[PDB]
Amino acid sequence: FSPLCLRALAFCALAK
Amino acid sequence: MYVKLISSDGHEFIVKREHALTSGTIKAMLSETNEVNFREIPSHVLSKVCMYFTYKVRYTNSTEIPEFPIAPEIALELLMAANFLDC
Amino acid sequence: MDVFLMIRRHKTTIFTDAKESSTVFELKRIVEGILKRPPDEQRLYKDDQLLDDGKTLGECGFTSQTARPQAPATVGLAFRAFEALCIEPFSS
């Protein structure tokens, strides 16, 4: 397991 | 060994080359010299990007992975930086 | 155990890590390799407190709970003329 890319993390910070 | 990443407001961030290569854009730009200017990314964003590099390398092929904190008010700028940097 | 740091002077910020049991002097040796000033021409700070060369980073207060990859601790840096400690803030 590796961290998600920063593009996806920034999206999740607003989407979830 | 190290590269220097320069933000739009002139802050210089000195980061291990191996960590900076988390960014596909930095890797391609370095393909030699060790300085890259980011004239559209301000230092409060680029500093957070550099923290991501450190965190990405430290926790690849990890056990539970701690949260990467992203305040809602910078998420869009961070996303646009990560779009440009491909990380 | 690794601690994760930002060493900051003026508009320079070095992202680096070290072991909690390494010493302040060994951290100055890292700064020398990057910025080409020897350890005796450096002062390192936690907030406004000078750090003694013989102390470990853990004894200075840099631990794995306060100095994490996603939230590194800040170490101030001043060079011998010593200049005042001066760290320019990031933008808003």
Side-chain angles (χ1 to χ4, degrees), chain A residues 2-16, chain B, chain C:
Chain A
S2 292
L4 283 47
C5 67
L6 184 57
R7 295 167 169 194
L9 289 180
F11 172 87
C12 293
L14 298 166
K16 285 206 197 312
Chain B
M1 175 85 253
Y2 287 90
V3 299
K4 174 190 296 193
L5 318 169
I6 306 180
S7 69
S8 68
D9 52 324
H11 277 266
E12 319 194 339
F13 296 90
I14 297 170
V15 170
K16 288 175 185 176
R17 179 182 197 267
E18 151 195 1
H19 295 196
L21 293 179
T22 304
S23 157
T25 295
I26 295 184
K27 180 185 309 179
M29 268 170 146
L30 297 178
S31 301
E32 94 268 29
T33 59
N34 296 314
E35 186 186 274
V36 182
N37 277 279
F38 301 104
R39 290 185 183 84
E40 327 291 339
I41 301 170
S43 57
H44 72 276
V45 176
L46 194 52
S47 62
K48 195 71 152 161
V49 169
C50 290
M51 298 175 197
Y52 177 78
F53 295 162
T54 314
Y55 164 92
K56 186 47 158 62
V57 168
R58 163 66 182 91
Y59 288 113
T60 55
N61 298 326
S62 201
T63 165
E64 290 169 289
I65 287 165
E67 221 64 34
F68 191 79
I70 298 179
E73 60 259 33
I74 53 89
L76 263 189
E77 294 181 285
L78 202 47
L79 168 60
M80 285 185 297
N83 285 342
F84 172 74
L85 295 166
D86 185 17
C87 66
Chain C
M1 180 51 205
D2 289 314
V3 296
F4 298 89
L5 310 174
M6 289 186 290
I7 304 171
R8 304 197 56 208
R9 164 188 184 271
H10 292 188
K11 284 181 129 183
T12 298
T13 295
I14 298 166
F15 279 80
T16 195
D17 50 271
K19 290 149 213 153
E20 201 174 308
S21 55
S22 58
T23 69
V24 165
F25 176 84
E26 284 171 319
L27 190 59
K28 293 176 169 184
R29 199 60 103 175
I30 288 172
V31 170
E32 167 179 37
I34 298 171
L35 298 179
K36 314 303 170 172
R37 306 288 304 266
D40 75 314
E41 295 173 28
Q42 301 177 36
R43 283 171 170 183
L44 301 185
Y45 290 81
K46 185 170 146 55
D47 305 314
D48 65 349
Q49 298 304 304
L50 274 167
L51 304 177
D52 292 320
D53 282 357
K55 315 238 289 190
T56 65
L57 301 182
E59 287 162 353
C60 290
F62 302 113
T63 76
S64 326
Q65 291 60 73
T66 51
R68 303 139 94 200
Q70 71 274 18
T74 293
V75 180
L77 162 68
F79 286 147
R80 188 170 78 190
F82 278 85
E83 70 190 6
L85 173 61
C86 182
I87 301 167
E88 294 296 320
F90 301 141
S91 57
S92 307

PDB file of all heavy atoms in Angstrom, chain C residues 9-33:
ATOM      1  N   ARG C   9      16.073  29.775   6.726  1.00  0.00           N
ATOM      2  CA  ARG C   9      16.767  31.046   6.888  1.00  0.00           C
ATOM      3  C   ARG C   9      16.334  31.962   5.755  1.00  0.00           C
ATOM      4  O   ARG C   9      16.409  31.562   4.588  1.00  0.00           O
ATOM      5  CB  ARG C   9      18.283  30.861   6.848  1.00  0.00           C
ATOM      6  CG  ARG C   9      19.031  32.165   6.632  1.00  0.00           C
ATOM      7  CD  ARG C   9      20.514  31.922   6.391  1.00  0.00           C
ATOM      8  NE  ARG C   9      21.238  33.182   6.273  1.00  0.00           N
ATOM      9  CZ  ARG C   9      21.411  33.839   5.134  1.00  0.00           C
ATOM     10  NH1 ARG C   9      20.971  33.355   3.984  1.00  0.00           N
ATOM     11  NH2 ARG C   9      22.031  35.015   5.151  1.00  0.00           N
ATOM     12  N   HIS C  10      15.912  33.181   6.096  1.00  0.00           N
ATOM     13  CA  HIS C  10      15.466  34.158   5.108  1.00  0.00           C
ATOM     14  C   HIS C  10      14.421  33.543   4.187  1.00  0.00           C
ATOM     15  O   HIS C  10      13.331  33.172   4.637  1.00  0.00           O
ATOM     16  CB  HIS C  10      16.649  34.700   4.299  1.00  0.00           C
ATOM     17  CG  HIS C  10      17.590  35.540   5.107  1.00  0.00           C
ATOM     18  ND1 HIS C  10      18.625  36.255   4.543  1.00  0.00           N
ATOM     19  CD2 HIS C  10      17.664  35.764   6.441  1.00  0.00           C
ATOM     20  CE1 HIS C  10      19.295  36.884   5.492  1.00  0.00           C
ATOM     21  NE2 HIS C  10      18.730  36.607   6.652  1.00  0.00           N
ATOM     22  N   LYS C  11      14.760  33.394   2.909  1.00  0.00           N
ATOM     23  CA  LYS C  11      13.879  32.765   1.935  1.00  0.00           C
ATOM     24  C   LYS C  11      14.414  31.418   1.456  1.00  0.00           C
ATOM     25  O   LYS C  11      14.114  30.990   0.339  1.00  0.00           O
ATOM     26  CB  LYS C  11      13.652  33.704   0.754  1.00  0.00           C
ATOM     27  CG  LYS C  11      12.681  34.839   1.057  1.00  0.00           C
ATOM     28  CD  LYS C  11      12.506  35.708  -0.176  1.00  0.00           C
ATOM     29  CE  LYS C  11      11.053  35.924  -0.497  1.00  0.00           C
ATOM     30  NZ  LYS C  11      10.928  36.729  -1.754  1.00  0.00           N
ATOM     31  N   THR C  12      15.217  30.749   2.284  1.00  0.00           N
ATOM     32  CA  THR C  12      15.700  29.402   2.016  1.00  0.00           C
ATOM     33  C   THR C  12      15.024  28.433   2.974  1.00  0.00           C
ATOM     34  O   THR C  12      14.920  28.712   4.172  1.00  0.00           O
ATOM     35  CB  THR C  12      17.222  29.308   2.184  1.00  0.00           C
ATOM     36  OG1 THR C  12      17.866  30.174   1.239  1.00  0.00           O
ATOM     37  CG2 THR C  12      17.711  27.852   1.977  1.00  0.00           C
ATOM     38  N   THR C  13      14.565  27.298   2.448  1.00  0.00           N
ATOM     39  CA  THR C  13      13.992  26.228   3.265  1.00  0.00           C
ATOM     40  C   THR C  13      14.556  24.900   2.783  1.00  0.00           C
ATOM     41  O   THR C  13      14.340  24.517   1.628  1.00  0.00           O
ATOM     42  CB  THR C  13      12.461  26.218   3.176  1.00  0.00           C
ATOM     43  OG1 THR C  13      11.932  27.424   3.745  1.00  0.00           O
ATOM     44  CG2 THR C  13      11.866  24.995   3.892  1.00  0.00           C
ATOM     45  N   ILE C  14      15.299  24.211   3.648  1.00  0.00           N
ATOM     46  CA  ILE C  14      15.832  22.887   3.345  1.00  0.00           C
ATOM     47  C   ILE C  14      14.905  21.848   3.960  1.00  0.00           C
ATOM     48  O   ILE C  14      14.659  21.870   5.174  1.00  0.00           O
ATOM     49  CB  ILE C  14      17.260  22.714   3.890  1.00  0.00           C
ATOM     50  CG1 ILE C  14      18.233  23.711   3.244  1.00  0.00           C
ATOM     51  CG2 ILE C  14      17.726  21.267   3.699  1.00  0.00           C
ATOM     52  CD1 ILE C  14      19.574  23.803   3.980  1.00  0.00           C
ATOM     53  N   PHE C  15      14.401  20.931   3.135  1.00  0.00           N
ATOM     54  CA  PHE C  15      13.673  19.760   3.618  1.00  0.00           C
ATOM     55  C   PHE C  15      14.670  18.621   3.801  1.00  0.00           C
ATOM     56  O   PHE C  15      15.332  18.214   2.844  1.00  0.00           O
ATOM     57  CB  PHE C  15      12.567  19.350   2.643  1.00  0.00           C
ATOM     58  CG  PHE C  15      11.298  20.171   2.772  1.00  0.00           C
ATOM     59  CD1 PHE C  15      11.201  21.429   2.185  1.00  0.00           C
ATOM     60  CD2 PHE C  15      10.194  19.663   3.448  1.00  0.00           C
ATOM     61  CE1 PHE C  15      10.028  22.191   2.304  1.00  0.00           C
ATOM     62  CE2 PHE C  15       9.013  20.409   3.571  1.00  0.00           C
ATOM     63  CZ  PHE C  15       8.927  21.671   3.003  1.00  0.00           C
ATOM     64  N   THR C  16      14.792  18.119   5.024  1.00  0.00           N
ATOM     65  CA  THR C  16      15.723  17.034   5.283  1.00  0.00           C
ATOM     66  C   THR C  16      15.222  16.249   6.485  1.00  0.00           C
ATOM     67  O   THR C  16      14.329  16.687   7.216  1.00  0.00           O
ATOM     68  CB  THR C  16      17.156  17.567   5.501  1.00  0.00           C
ATOM     69  OG1 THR C  16      18.097  16.492   5.411  1.00  0.00           O
ATOM     70  CG2 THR C  16      17.296  18.234   6.869  1.00  0.00           C
ATOM     71  N   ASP C  17      15.804  15.073   6.679  1.00  0.00           N
ATOM     72  CA  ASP C  17      15.481  14.226   7.813  1.00  0.00           C
ATOM     73  C   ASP C  17      16.768  13.777   8.497  1.00  0.00           C
ATOM     74  O   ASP C  17      17.857  13.860   7.932  1.00  0.00           O
ATOM     75  CB  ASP C  17      14.665  13.006   7.392  1.00  0.00           C
ATOM     76  CG  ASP C  17      15.285  12.274   6.223  1.00  0.00           C
ATOM     77  OD1 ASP C  17      14.976  12.627   5.055  1.00  0.00           O
ATOM     78  OD2 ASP C  17      16.103  11.368   6.479  1.00  0.00           O
ATOM     79  N   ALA C  18      16.623  13.293   9.724  1.00  0.00           N
ATOM     80  CA  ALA C  18      17.744  12.773  10.491  1.00  0.00           C
ATOM     81  C   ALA C  18      17.180  11.866  11.572  1.00  0.00           C
ATOM     82  O   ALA C  18      15.974  11.840  11.820  1.00  0.00           O
ATOM     83  CB  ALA C  18      18.583  13.905  11.103  1.00  0.00           C
ATOM     84  N   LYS C  19      18.066  11.123  12.222  1.00  0.00           N
ATOM     85  CA  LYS C  19      17.624  10.291  13.329  1.00  0.00           C
ATOM     86  C   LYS C  19      17.434  11.141  14.572  1.00  0.00           C
ATOM     87  O   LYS C  19      18.130  12.136  14.783  1.00  0.00           O
ATOM     88  CB  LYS C  19      18.616   9.155  13.584  1.00  0.00           C
ATOM     89  CG  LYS C  19      18.606   8.117  12.463  1.00  0.00           C
ATOM     90  CD  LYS C  19      19.962   7.467  12.274  1.00  0.00           C
ATOM     91  CE  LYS C  19      20.192   7.112  10.810  1.00  0.00           C
ATOM     92  NZ  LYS C  19      21.647   7.099  10.448  1.00  0.00           N
ATOM     93  N   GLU C  20      16.457  10.750  15.394  1.00  0.00           N
ATOM     94  CA  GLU C  20      16.221  11.428  16.663  1.00  0.00           C
ATOM     95  C   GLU C  20      17.455  11.408  17.565  1.00  0.00           C
ATOM     96  O   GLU C  20      17.625  12.310  18.395  1.00  0.00           O
ATOM     97  CB  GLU C  20      15.023  10.770  17.363  1.00  0.00           C
ATOM     98  CG  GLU C  20      14.361  11.622  18.405  1.00  0.00           C
ATOM     99  CD  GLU C  20      13.097  10.988  18.961  1.00  0.00           C
ATOM    100  OE1 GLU C  20      12.207  10.591  18.174  1.00  0.00           O
ATOM    101  OE2 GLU C  20      12.994  10.880  20.197  1.00  0.00           O
ATOM    102  N   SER C  21      18.327  10.410  17.411  1.00  0.00           N
ATOM    103  CA  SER C  21      19.553  10.314  18.193  1.00  0.00           C
ATOM    104  C   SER C  21      20.750  11.008  17.545  1.00  0.00           C
ATOM    105  O   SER C  21      21.841  10.994  18.125  1.00  0.00           O
ATOM    106  CB  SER C  21      19.891   8.841  18.444  1.00  0.00           C
ATOM    107  OG  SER C  21      19.973   8.129  17.213  1.00  0.00           O
ATOM    108  N   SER C  22      20.600  11.598  16.362  1.00  0.00           N
ATOM    109  CA  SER C  22      21.714  12.372  15.825  1.00  0.00           C
ATOM    110  C   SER C  22      21.841  13.684  16.595  1.00  0.00           C
ATOM    111  O   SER C  22      20.935  14.082  17.323  1.00  0.00           O
ATOM    112  CB  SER C  22      21.531  12.621  14.322  1.00  0.00           C
ATOM    113  OG  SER C  22      20.315  13.296  14.047  1.00  0.00           O
ATOM    114  N   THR C  23      22.986  14.356  16.455  1.00  0.00           N
ATOM    115  CA  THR C  23      23.235  15.561  17.237  1.00  0.00           C
ATOM    116  C   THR C  23      23.073  16.825  16.398  1.00  0.00           C
ATOM    117  O   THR C  23      23.037  16.795  15.163  1.00  0.00           O
ATOM    118  CB  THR C  23      24.630  15.546  17.869  1.00  0.00           C
ATOM    119  OG1 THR C  23      25.631  15.675  16.849  1.00  0.00           O
ATOM    120  CG2 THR C  23      24.852  14.255  18.669  1.00  0.00           C
ATOM    121  N   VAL C  24      22.967  17.956  17.113  1.00  0.00           N
ATOM    122  CA  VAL C  24      22.866  19.265  16.471  1.00  0.00           C
ATOM    123  C   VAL C  24      24.052  19.496  15.537  1.00  0.00           C
ATOM    124  O   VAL C  24      23.893  20.017  14.424  1.00  0.00           O
ATOM    125  CB  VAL C  24      22.757  20.371  17.540  1.00  0.00           C
ATOM    126  CG1 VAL C  24      23.024  21.743  16.933  1.00  0.00           C
ATOM    127  CG2 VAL C  24      21.391  20.328  18.233  1.00  0.00           C
ATOM    128  N   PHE C  25      25.257  19.106  15.971  1.00  0.00           N
ATOM    129  CA  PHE C  25      26.443  19.246  15.126  1.00  0.00           C
ATOM    130  C   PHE C  25      26.310  18.453  13.830  1.00  0.00           C
ATOM    131  O   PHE C  25      26.727  18.921  12.763  1.00  0.00           O
ATOM    132  CB  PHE C  25      27.690  18.790  15.882  1.00  0.00           C
ATOM    133  CG  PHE C  25      28.947  18.803  15.042  1.00  0.00           C
ATOM    134  CD1 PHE C  25      29.676  19.974  14.884  1.00  0.00           C
ATOM    135  CD2 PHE C  25      29.400  17.647  14.425  1.00  0.00           C
ATOM    136  CE1 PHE C  25      30.840  19.998  14.119  1.00  0.00           C
ATOM    137  CE2 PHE C  25      30.561  17.663  13.647  1.00  0.00           C
ATOM    138  CZ  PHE C  25      31.279  18.841  13.495  1.00  0.00           C
ATOM    139  N   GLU C  26      25.772  17.232  13.908  1.00  0.00           N
ATOM    140  CA  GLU C  26      25.611  16.420  12.708  1.00  0.00           C
ATOM    141  C   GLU C  26      24.611  17.057  11.751  1.00  0.00           C
ATOM    142  O   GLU C  26      24.777  16.984  10.528  1.00  0.00           O
ATOM    143  CB  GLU C  26      25.189  14.996  13.093  1.00  0.00           C
ATOM    144  CG  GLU C  26      26.349  14.172  13.647  1.00  0.00           C
ATOM    145  CD  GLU C  26      25.934  12.822  14.233  1.00  0.00           C
ATOM    146  OE1 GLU C  26      24.893  12.745  14.930  1.00  0.00           O
ATOM    147  OE2 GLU C  26      26.672  11.837  14.006  1.00  0.00           O
ATOM    148  N   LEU C  27      23.581  17.712  12.291  1.00  0.00           N
ATOM    149  CA  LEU C  27      22.648  18.452  11.442  1.00  0.00           C
ATOM    150  C   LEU C  27      23.331  19.647  10.779  1.00  0.00           C
ATOM    151  O   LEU C  27      23.095  19.926   9.597  1.00  0.00           O
ATOM    152  CB  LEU C  27      21.431  18.896  12.255  1.00  0.00           C
ATOM    153  CG  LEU C  27      20.245  19.480  11.459  1.00  0.00           C
ATOM    154  CD1 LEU C  27      19.722  18.470  10.445  1.00  0.00           C
ATOM    155  CD2 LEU C  27      19.108  19.958  12.373  1.00  0.00           C
ATOM    156  N   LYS C  28      24.203  20.350  11.506  1.00  0.00           N
ATOM    157  CA  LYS C  28      24.986  21.423  10.887  1.00  0.00           C
ATOM    158  C   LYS C  28      25.887  20.893   9.779  1.00  0.00           C
ATOM    159  O   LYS C  28      26.119  21.585   8.779  1.00  0.00           O
ATOM    160  CB  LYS C  28      25.848  22.142  11.931  1.00  0.00           C
ATOM    161  CG  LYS C  28      25.066  22.933  12.951  1.00  0.00           C
ATOM    162  CD  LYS C  28      25.999  23.548  14.020  1.00  0.00           C
ATOM    163  CE  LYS C  28      25.243  24.561  14.867  1.00  0.00           C
ATOM    164  NZ  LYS C  28      26.141  25.239  15.844  1.00  0.00           N
ATOM    165  N   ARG C  29      26.397  19.673   9.936  1.00  0.00           N
ATOM    166  CA  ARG C  29      27.179  19.055   8.867  1.00  0.00           C
ATOM    167  C   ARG C  29      26.331  18.842   7.609  1.00  0.00           C
ATOM    168  O   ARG C  29      26.833  18.963   6.487  1.00  0.00           O
ATOM    169  CB  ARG C  29      27.769  17.735   9.375  1.00  0.00           C
ATOM    170  CG  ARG C  29      28.916  17.212   8.580  1.00  0.00           C
ATOM    171  CD  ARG C  29      30.050  18.228   8.598  1.00  0.00           C
ATOM    172  NE  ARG C  29      31.139  17.865   9.497  1.00  0.00           N
ATOM    173  CZ  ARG C  29      32.268  18.550   9.593  1.00  0.00           C
ATOM    174  NH1 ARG C  29      32.454  19.672   8.913  1.00  0.00           N
ATOM    175  NH2 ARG C  29      33.236  18.097  10.385  1.00  0.00           N
ATOM    176  N   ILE C  30      25.041  18.536   7.774  1.00  0.00           N
ATOM    177  CA  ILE C  30      24.146  18.420   6.620  1.00  0.00           C
ATOM    178  C   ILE C  30      23.965  19.777   5.949  1.00  0.00           C
ATOM    179  O   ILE C  30      24.021  19.897   4.718  1.00  0.00           O
ATOM    180  CB  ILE C  30      22.793  17.818   7.052  1.00  0.00           C
ATOM    181  CG1 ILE C  30      22.946  16.333   7.378  1.00  0.00           C
ATOM    182  CG2 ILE C  30      21.710  18.045   5.987  1.00  0.00           C
ATOM    183  CD1 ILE C  30      21.682  15.732   8.008  1.00  0.00           C
ATOM    184  N   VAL C  31      23.739  20.819   6.751  1.00  0.00           N
ATOM    185  CA  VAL C  31      23.575  22.167   6.213  1.00  0.00           C
ATOM    186  C   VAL C  31      24.831  22.609   5.468  1.00  0.00           C
ATOM    187  O   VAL C  31      24.745  23.255   4.415  1.00  0.00           O
ATOM    188  CB  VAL C  31      23.215  23.157   7.336  1.00  0.00           C
ATOM    189  CG1 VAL C  31      23.288  24.585   6.805  1.00  0.00           C
ATOM    190  CG2 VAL C  31      21.829  22.858   7.896  1.00  0.00           C
ATOM    191  N   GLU C  32      26.015  22.258   5.990  1.00  0.00           N
ATOM    192  CA  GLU C  32      27.264  22.650   5.331  1.00  0.00           C
ATOM    193  C   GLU C  32      27.369  22.063   3.925  1.00  0.00           C
ATOM    194  O   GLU C  32      27.771  22.755   2.984  1.00  0.00           O
ATOM    195  CB  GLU C  32      28.473  22.221   6.172  1.00  0.00           C
ATOM    196  CG  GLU C  32      29.820  22.313   5.428  1.00  0.00           C
ATOM    197  CD  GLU C  32      30.999  21.892   6.291  1.00  0.00           C
ATOM    198  OE1 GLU C  32      30.849  20.942   7.089  1.00  0.00           O
ATOM    199  OE2 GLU C  32      32.073  22.522   6.187  1.00  0.00           O
ATOM    200  N   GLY C  33      27.028  20.783   3.768  1.00  0.00           N
ATOM    201  CA  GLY C  33      27.066  20.172   2.450  1.00  0.00           C
ATOM    202  C   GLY C  33      26.158  20.857   1.444  1.00  0.00           C
ATOM    203  O   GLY C  33      26.445  20.854   0.247  1.00  0.00           O
TER     204      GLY C  33
END
